[PDB]
Design a protein around this ligand. Structure first.
Ligand SMILES: [Mg+2]
Ligand SMILES: [Mg+2]
Ligand SMILES: [Mg+2]
Ligand SMILES: [Mg+2]
Ligand SMILES: [Mg+2]
Ligand SMILES: [Mg+2]
Ligand SMILES: [Mg+2]
Ligand SMILES: [Mg+2]
Ligand SMILES: [Mg+2]
Ligand SMILES: [Mg+2]
Ligand SMILES: [Mg+2]
Ligand SMILES: [Mg+2]
Ligand SMILES: [Mg+2]
Ligand SMILES: [Mg+2]
Ligand SMILES: [Mg+2]
Ligand SMILES: [Mg+2]
Ligand SMILES: [Mg+2]
Ligand SMILES: [Mg+2]
Ligand SMILES: [Mg+2]
Ligand SMILES: [Mg+2]
Ligand SMILES: [Mg+2]
Ligand SMILES: [Mg+2]
Ligand SMILES: [Mg+2]
Ligand SMILES: [Mg+2]
Ligand SMILES: [Mg+2]
Lengths: 177, 206, 143, 262
RNA sequence: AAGCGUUUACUUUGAAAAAAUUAGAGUGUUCAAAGCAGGCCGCCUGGAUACCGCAGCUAGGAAUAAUGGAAUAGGACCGCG
RNA sequence: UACCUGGUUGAUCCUGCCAGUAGCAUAUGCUUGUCUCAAAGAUUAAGCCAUGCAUGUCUAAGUACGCACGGCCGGUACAGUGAAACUGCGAAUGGCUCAUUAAAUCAGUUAUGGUUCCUUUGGUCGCUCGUACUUGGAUAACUGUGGUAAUUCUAGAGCUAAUACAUGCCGACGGGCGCUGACCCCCUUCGCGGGGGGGAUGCGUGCAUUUAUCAGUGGUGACUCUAGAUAACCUCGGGCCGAUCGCACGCCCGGCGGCGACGACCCAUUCGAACGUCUGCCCUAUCAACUUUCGAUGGUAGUCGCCGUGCCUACCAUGGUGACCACGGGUGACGGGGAAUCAGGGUUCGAUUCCGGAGAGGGAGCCUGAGAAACGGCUACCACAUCCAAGGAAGGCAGCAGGCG
RNA sequence: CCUCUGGCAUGUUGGAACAAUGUAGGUAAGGGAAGUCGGCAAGCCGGAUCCGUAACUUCGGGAUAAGGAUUGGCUCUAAGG
């Protein structure tokens, strides 16, 4: 059973674990589960124990510190490639994306590159221009339809006031009667 | 869990209805907010339909309206003085709908002296040397002095309200539901309602 | 008179503390040709559950029952009667239903044994769903 | 049922779809849309069982997602779309335009129209709303909530809608003498002039309608759809022209037709 | 034309009333139980109608059976102050 | 098809039952050549279940650096299929069963003016007046060390994206509208005064939310409706005002552009749901009084809930139902559309293919989600039961097959 | 049971030890009448408030039946003139 950070025994204990807890992968959404984890205090009753060296000593151990493992993937976000290769705001990123070499038996050697996500490209600029054109034509058609309704209401209200005008004229005729 | 059921209780005749289904989810109850006075702490609750509710737990300020002269201000709440529901809601200081609180009269005094330029509160003998009330009350032009003179005939206040202003704190009644909406909105008690609740607080003191 | 409860008993809509220098009463018509009574306008009571001066809508069914008991406060019990037809025998049964209806204090003098029109509203209590809409006196009983 | 239901049995389907008893356990459940569950006719029912352009639901899917059919001036790609009353289902390759009206019986009819008629259709207003800046809103029977309408158009009228702009052109006020379609109930599919309006406060109001051949009949307001000023409609009427001649007259008119054809 | 008109019960009509079932219309599944199809040298068509108790809604009828009015005139009607 | 016959007597006429007669199911016996349809572990045991299956899902349009395949035209990213994995949606439908439940479920009828509603469809999405040529940092798949008798168990180390999760602006946009108003000017008076215009500066100024005040565009039979004005608020467990995606690719003189996808406040609409209104059900009195401060019936004021309401709490009132059968008990009781028998009457059945309900061994509690008190989801307790190294882990056929009883 | 007024010097002796056996109080783990003629003796329960109370019966009782819960201090609130 795995040890778990922040449980503060030396033995084993059972917990409800959720999404975002350690030592548990939920299958369906919102699922919780009883799992039995181990205390975070170390004692002699451990099968395997994980150690992470943070400070380099004097000696070059042939197990760990001699062989550098190269990091497998290169940065994909344009912002992180700007941070990695210290780009300015103006200069391009596309020549400074790391591409990876590819070689095995039989087939041709290749070089492969990631899709650079979130860069300023003309399709993004076209989308941004398109919805702001949608906004200005929404205000346009609102102005149009409101003015058209104002004209139609002015028509109907002058009709109603002239009809009630001849009705008030009939009232004055009956009062003169 | 805690439920709101008509099926769990007796008929009109007094007979016992036997349940045919479980406690459904939609017949739901929840623990009370029991909103106190303190530095504000509002929890959100997920609601039927994916909505949300804002339970106050501690709540220091609230937006109270002074209805006769139409000014509402965010105002700090100091005490709960009366509750028609229960006296323990007065004792353990609890904000519910239609509970009666005390709130400090300082924003209403600021608005009143800004609007009419007359002293309200002000036990006479004290005078503010930092001159802010002086530039509030003075310095009007000749064109606008008759405007303020036209206002100050409609600037007389009730004597009970003027006592509460000299006290520095006035009675309000809460009208929002602070366990439901989140706010402590209400209105200043005036007139017949005011002297009714003053008679109730005087009868409580004795 | 009024103000016999713990809280202040007031009609919610009308604001009574506008500054001066009597109290305006809120009322309405409930419709369906039911003429709102005179005591609902010259009245000094307030009522949350009055059909004329309160926040209830009369909607749906319009029934009529017979007042039997007026012991509950602001509400009474009417007794409806009807003939139920069994189909084997070609006869009727006298059955009855006792429902509790809300009696506003605008209808002042009501005795037992007079036919009362009620109207369906929102559920006002556990067993009350009807307001009293108009009252007619009994057979004679004008003394 | 712990939520919304998604199926429909073949037996419990509304009968005017005229689905056979034997070939299926399920009927096609109409998707939610601008018409009610029992008032609409699904587009799979319109193609497969009646026009027979398709044979099964897979061919219905192929027709509907080659982007061919264009209902109410717009292409819908779902099989079970609800096509209801007065809807214009247009097919572009055959050049064939269909308007959805009930015939003399309760069922819907294949009703071929011209493109000049298919450019518009007609809608009963259900409610007038006032929106967030004093903006008059008109709501139709197919939920077309066009706003700023003509302030003479009120609650129970009908309007003519140009589909390309999606906007009103003219209207018919609900008044006596106007023709009306009965869109529901036992009188489903009749055509006649409104001869009387009976008001009822609280309950639903009824209307006496006198048809083309004298036979008057009453129907409540919610089932009534006015179709034109006076004695003439604004749409083209189907075969039969909304009479419901009796079963004896149906009998002898088919008997005389078969006797005359031979 | 709109509104009001002792109240019911009863009777009549109209609405509203899921299909499948039952009765039942059409229709040579080779007949039938069935099914909603089919028929003509592309066209012509059907997939009806009835019943749906009780209760509630509507509009006519007033015979039968209840129910009321004016009797310490707090009665109608016409007006008056 | 509105039907009778034998039987008490030595014989008769009767009341009268027993028995014959005819269907419709359930089992069973004996028999069974053709063909069309067709019920089927409901009755006792809603008793127990080995094994297998029964819910997953990718488009041109969210994420693709697994050479897992593949094109050469590269050097100004990304051809295109694409396993996996993250994300979104479904998994609350369907299927099965009848144990519960007797004004309950359910049927007809109404109401929501007393509420919620994913999706669909239609509206709205420069309305506010105060780095945007695109912001941040995680994480899975991948790689590499492992642990455990064992599971759809997972730890530690490295990398790396978003339509996952956060942050957050320019534009429109120059002013209108209110308040504030220094000051300016005109008329008139002995003059104060009176009467009238113009206006520096500052504050606020959208929709939703919450509260209070005023007036009475569009409605309804009827609002405390809808809309308008004012005054403040706008929840840090934060309501909107797009930091997205794909096809064709153009036009001004770098800027304007077409057609769609996806996403969201609010409003209608749809599928509903849930509480209500009125009327309706089998037997039993060897069940005649029941309910009631341990809510029973109301009133008031609140809490909770989506809303109405004793739903719950506090304070008061002493009510509420019953011979018109309440209350209690039984049911070999799910209700109903219907089925069988039938002259007219009725009588019995309805576990069962359609509608509604309830339930997944028994009860209870709950996460997520629009919708679950969900069980082919979790959390316990009881009963039953599988594997084990004895420390632990996993279960729910009243789904389809099938097995036991 | 403790104290005030009033009374007294522990009841016909004092001192030093603290052994057995006593007389008179107590306490006991685990069991709980196996002891004994026999639960002898000791022990349990115990007041009050709020509930709840059976067989039987002379209808009066049984009945404080049996069986439960609560109880202190303090700070308040309500009601009873
Ligand atoms: Mg009979
Ligand atoms: Mg289901
Ligand atoms: Mg039917
Ligand atoms: Mg004999
Ligand atoms: Mg013999
Ligand atoms: Mg026999
Ligand atoms: Mg043969
Ligand atoms: Mg079984
Ligand atoms: Mg049973
Ligand atoms: Mg049963
Ligand atoms: Mg059944
Ligand atoms: Mg059974
Ligand atoms: Mg369930
Ligand atoms: Mg089982
Ligand atoms: Mg299930
Ligand atoms: Mg469950
Ligand atoms: Mg299962
Ligand atoms: Mg002594
Ligand atoms: Mg002595
Ligand atoms: Mg002595
Ligand atoms: Mg002992
Ligand atoms: Mg002991
Ligand atoms: Mg012995
Ligand atoms: Mg003894
Ligand atoms: Mg005894």
């Amino acid at each position: 059973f795995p040890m778990k950070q922040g449980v503060l025994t030396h033995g084993r204990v059972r917990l409800l674990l959720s999404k975002g807890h350690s030592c548990y992968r939920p299958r369906r959404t919102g699922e919780r589960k009883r799992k039995s984890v181990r205390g975070c205090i170390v004692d002699a009753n451990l099968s395997v124990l994980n150690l992470v060296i943070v400070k380099k000593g004097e000696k070059d151990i042939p197990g760990l510190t001699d062989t550098t493992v190269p990091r497998r993937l290169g940065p994909k976000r344009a912002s992180r490639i700007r941070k990695l290769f210290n780009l300015s705001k103006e200069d391009d990123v596309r020549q400074y994306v790391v591409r990876k070499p590819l070689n095995k038996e039989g087939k041709k050697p290749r070089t492969k590159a990631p899709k650079i996500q979130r860069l300023v490209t003309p399709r993004v600029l076209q989308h941004k221009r398109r919805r702001i054109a949608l906004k200005k034509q929404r205000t346009k058609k609102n102005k149009e339809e409101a003015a058209e309704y104002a004209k139609l209401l002015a028509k109907r209200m002058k009709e109603a006031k002239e009809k009630r005008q001849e009705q008030i004229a009939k009232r004055r005729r009956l009062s003169s009667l | 869990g805690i439920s709101r059921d008509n099926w769990h209780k007796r008929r009109k005749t007094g007979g016992k209805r036997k349940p045919y289904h479980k406690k459904r989810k939609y017949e739901l109850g929840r623990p009370a907010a029991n909103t106190k006075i303190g530095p504000r702490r509002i929890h959100t609750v997920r609601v039927r339909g994916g909505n949300k509710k804002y339970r106050a737990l501690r709540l220091d300020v609230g937006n109270f309206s002074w209805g006769s002269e139409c000014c509402t201000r965010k105002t700090r709440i100091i005490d709960v003085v009366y509750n028609a529901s229960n006296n323990e809601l007065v004792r353990t200081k609890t904000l519910v709908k239609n509970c009666i609180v005390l709130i400090d009269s300082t924003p209403y005094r600021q608005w009143y002296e800004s609007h009419y330029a007359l002293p309200l509160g002000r036990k006479k003998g004290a005078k503010l040397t930092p001159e802010e009330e002086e530039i509030l009350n003075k310095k009007r032009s000749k064109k606008i002095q008759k405007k303020y003179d036209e206002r100050k005939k409609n600037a007389k206040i009730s004597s009970l309200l003027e006592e509460q202003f000299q006290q520095g704190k006035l009675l309000a009644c809460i009208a929002s539901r602070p366990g439901q909406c989140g706010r402590a909105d209400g209105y200043v008690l005036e007139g017949k309602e005011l002297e009714f609740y003053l008679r109730k607080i005087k009868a409580r003191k004795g | 008179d009024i103000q016999t409860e713990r809280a202040y008993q007031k009609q919610p809509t009308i604001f009574q503390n506008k500054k001066r220098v009597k109290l305006p009463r809120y009322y309405k018509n409930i419709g369906l040709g039911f003429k709102t009574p005179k005591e609902a306008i010259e009245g000094t009571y307030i009522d949350k559950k009055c059909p004329f001066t309160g926040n209830v809508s009369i909607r749906g069914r319009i029934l009529s029952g017979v007042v039997t008991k007026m012991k509950m406060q602001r509400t009474i019990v009417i007794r409806r009667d009807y003939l139920h037809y069994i189909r084997k025998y070609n006869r009727f049964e006298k059955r009855h239903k006792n429902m509790s209806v809300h009696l506003s204090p605008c209808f002042r003098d009501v005795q037992i044994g007079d036919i009362v029109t009620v109207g369906e509203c929102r559920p006002l209590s556990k067993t009350v769903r009807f307001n009293v809409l108009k009252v007619t006196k009994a057979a004679g009983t004008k003394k | 049922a712990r939520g919304p239901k998604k199926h429909l049995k073949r037996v419990a389907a509304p009968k005017h779809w005229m689905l056979d008893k034997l070939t299926g356990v399920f009927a096609p459940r109409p998707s939610t849309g601008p018409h009610k569950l029992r008032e609409c006719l699904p587009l799979i029912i319109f193609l497969r069982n009646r026009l027979k352009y398709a044979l099964t639901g897979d061919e219905v899917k192929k027709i509907c997602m080659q982007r061919f059919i264009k209902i109410d001036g717009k292409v819908r790609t779902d099989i079970t779309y609800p096509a209801g009353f007065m809807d214009v289902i247009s097919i572009d390759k055959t050049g064939e335009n269909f308007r959805l009206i009930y015939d003399t019986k309760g069922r819907f009819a294949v009703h071929r129209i011209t493109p000049e008629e298919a450019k518009y259709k007609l809608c009963k207003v259900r409610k007038i709303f006032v929106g967030t800046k004093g903006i008059p809103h008109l709501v139709t029977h197919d939920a077309r909530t066009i706003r700023y309408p003509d302030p003479l158009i009120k609650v129970n009228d009908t309007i003519q809608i140009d589909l390309e702009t999606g906007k009103i052109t003219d209207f018919i006020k609900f008044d006596t003498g106007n023709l009306c379609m009965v869109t529901g109930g036992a009188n489903l599919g009749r055509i006649g002039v409104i001869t009387n309006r009976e008001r009822h406060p609280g309950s639903f109001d009824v209307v006496h309608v006198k048809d083309a051949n004298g036979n008057s009949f009453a129907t409540r307001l919610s089932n009534i759809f006015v179709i034109g000023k006076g004695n003439k409609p604004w749409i083209s009427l189907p075969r039969g022209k909304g009479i419901r001649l009796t079963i004896a007259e149906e009998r002898d008119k088919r008997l005389a037709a078969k006797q005359s054809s031979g």
